[PDB]
Task: inverse folding
RNA sequence: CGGUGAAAUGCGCAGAUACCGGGAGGAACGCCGAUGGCGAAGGCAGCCACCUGGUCCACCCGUGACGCUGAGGCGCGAAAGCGUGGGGAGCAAACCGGAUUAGAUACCCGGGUAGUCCACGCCCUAAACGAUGCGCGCUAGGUCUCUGGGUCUCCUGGGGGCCGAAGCUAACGCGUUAAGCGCGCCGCCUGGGGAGUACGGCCGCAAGGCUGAAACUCAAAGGAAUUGACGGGGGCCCGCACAAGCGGUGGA
């Protein structure tokens, strides 16, 4: 983006709950344009969630994002010697986006044999405060105030 | 034009190296002799003042240097 | 051992390192701290964070000697001179005054090649 | 603690750094301070008093051409450097040690002797530059500034700058602070390299200085300006160029 600021894509609302966040997540699950399979892996994972907790999966979902959303991170700057690892606060969107990505990426790590489950579980675990979804949030946030000695080379 | 010390004063003797109450006003928060910009003084005046303050400091009446108090 | 009501916090910041000693109202030092004492090695001592540390520990050791209030004297241009202050300011010591007393020669010793 | 891009050498539990008080010592004078002033130049800034040079303005009082220039001579002459004596804080050639680097044998860091400081005597060179000899007359103005005088809106002298008439210039530029228009007098130049070398002479305690070639060799050496290209120069802008992503190649 060198001339203009790039204008965020407006997503279509979800076909079951209406929350655009649902869809954003879905897309991140799918691969190779296989949107149907994705939705199925999402919505079936809701069923397991609606099953093993009783409450509403939409909200366990909308909760498991706050608990992976990193309040700030480290970016990179090079000054006059080499590259001091600089801290810097993370925007509205970049948080939401980092979250969905991380949820999926580490959901896919879990030992569970089937996809829908793997999503369901990570989407549950993290919704509480455990599981390598948060531990990769509690990681990027760790280095945020572990290199705060270099927090004056800001932009 | 923050405030010119030529105006806030009547007439005085620039060669008077004892008139602390006057001289005092041509120094900064530090002992530093104000710039002609803030003194409003003539070209000739400032050189005269300059010597008078030096004379008076040496006499013990005006300070060589101060210390800046964060006010 | 002693009990010191009010006192002085001297802050001497280099480009290389920031030292903070705390003294009695007669100026005799009680406890001090620096960036290296915090436990930093080289380049890292001269840092607005290292300095925020040096100050905090300085007042930590201090309020254990009963310290309550302090007048502050900073000598020097340098990083986190300002941080050292604010660190003191919001440390739990009431900050009576701040002054700068950085020694400016009235034109004396020829300085080293790199000035 | 210090120190650098990072770091070590160094210093520190014989208590350093940081802090307060006492003392000694040397060297340089912050602010005023200017894009300012003075000087023939080199150069000259804390303050005071003494001794002393140049210089500007007013008055238009005295002399009555007494003027200008100036081979040689004589004196001044930054810094480094020489001799004797004193001094030595900080700094710092050489030298010692740490790093860097392909190698440093330099640039960076920690030390450190001469020296830098005073007196006396030498040295006498410089990008000693305005790279512009001195003196005088003449040739629009504008503006800023230091400094005199007036019937001090403004007028009138002497400096210092910027911009410009005429003119000058190869151009850049100069332009009443001339590089313009003229007169006087001095110094100097006559292709590049060889070469500020050789020889000789003079000065010098020395280091060395002043004066100064040719043989030879080249066909250029040069000045300013133009277009371009390039810059580990600056400014603004663009490309999936980097970044932010998604998916791969490199492995089988
Ligand atoms: Mg733009
Ligand atoms: Mg002392
Ligand atoms: Mg001594
Ligand atoms: Mg002159
Ligand atoms: Mg000069
Ligand atoms: Mg007459
Ligand atoms: Mg006669
Ligand atoms: Mg007569
Ligand atoms: Mg004469
Ligand atoms: Mg003559
Ligand atoms: Mg000499
Ligand atoms: Mg000398
Ligand atoms: Mg000598
Ligand atoms: Mg000697
Ligand atoms: Mg070496
Ligand atoms: Mg050295
Ligand atoms: Mg040294
Ligand atoms: Mg006249
Ligand atoms: Mg005038
Ligand atoms: Mg003039
Ligand atoms: Mg001109
Ligand atoms: Mg013309
Ligand atoms: Mg003339
Ligand atoms: Mg000519
Ligand atoms: Mg010839
Ligand atoms: Mg020839
Ligand atoms: Mg010669
Ligand atoms: Mg020579
Ligand atoms: Mg010569
Ligand atoms: Mg000879
Ligand atoms: Mg001899
Ligand atoms: Mg000569
Ligand atoms: Mg040329
Ligand atoms: Mg460029
Ligand atoms: Mg990329
Ligand atoms: Mg890849
Ligand atoms: Mg292959």
Result:
């Amino acid at each position: 983006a060198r001339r203009r600021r790039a204008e965020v894509r407006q997503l279509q609302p979800d076909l079951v709950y209406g929350d655009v966040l649902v869809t954003a997540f879905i897309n991140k699950i799918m691969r190779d344009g296989k949107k149907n399979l994705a939705a199925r892996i999402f919505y079936d994972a809701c069923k397991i969630i609606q099953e093993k907790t009783g409450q509403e999966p939409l909200k366990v979902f909308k909760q498991a994002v706050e608990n992976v959303k990193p309040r700030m991170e480290v970016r990179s700057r090079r000054v006059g010697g080499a590259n001091y690892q600089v801290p810097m606060e993370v925007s509205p969107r970049r948080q939401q986006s980092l979250a969905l990505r991380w949820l999926v990426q580490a959901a896919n790590q879990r030992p569970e044999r089937r996809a829908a489950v793997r999503i369901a579980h990570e989407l549950m675990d993290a919704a509480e405060g455990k599981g390598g979804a948060v531990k990769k949030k509690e990681d990027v946030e760790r280095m945020a105030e572990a290199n705060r000695a270099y927090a004056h080379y800001r932009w | 034009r923050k405030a010119k010390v030529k105006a806030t004063l009547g007439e005085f003797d620039l060669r008077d190296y004892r008139n602390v109450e006057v001289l005092k006003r041509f120094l900064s928060e530090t002992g530093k002799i104000l710039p002609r910009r803030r003194t409003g003084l003539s070209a000739k005046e400032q050189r005269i003042l300059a010597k008078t303050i030096k004379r008076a400091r040496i006499l013990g009446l005006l300070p060589f240097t101060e210390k800046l108090v964060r006010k | 051992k002693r009990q010191v009501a009010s006192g002085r916090a001297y802050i001497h910041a280099s480009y290389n390192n920031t030292i903070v000693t705390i003294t009695d109202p007669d100026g005799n030092p009680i406890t001090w701290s620096s960036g290296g004492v915090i436990g930093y090695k080289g380049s890292r001592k001269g840092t607005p964070y290292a300095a925020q540390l040096a100050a905090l520990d300085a007042a930590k050791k201090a309020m254990a000697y009963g310290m309550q209030s302090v007048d502050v004297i900073v000598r020097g241009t340098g990083a986190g001179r300002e941080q050292a202050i604010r660190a003191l300011q919001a440390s739990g010591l009431q900050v009576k005054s701040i002054v700068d007393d950085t020694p400016v020669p009235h034109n004396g010793c020829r300085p080293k090649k790199k000035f």
About this structure: Chains A and B do not touch (no CB pair under 8 Å). Residues 1-3, 6, 31, 79-82, 94, 97, 101 of chain A lie near RNA strand D (CB under 10 Å from a C1').
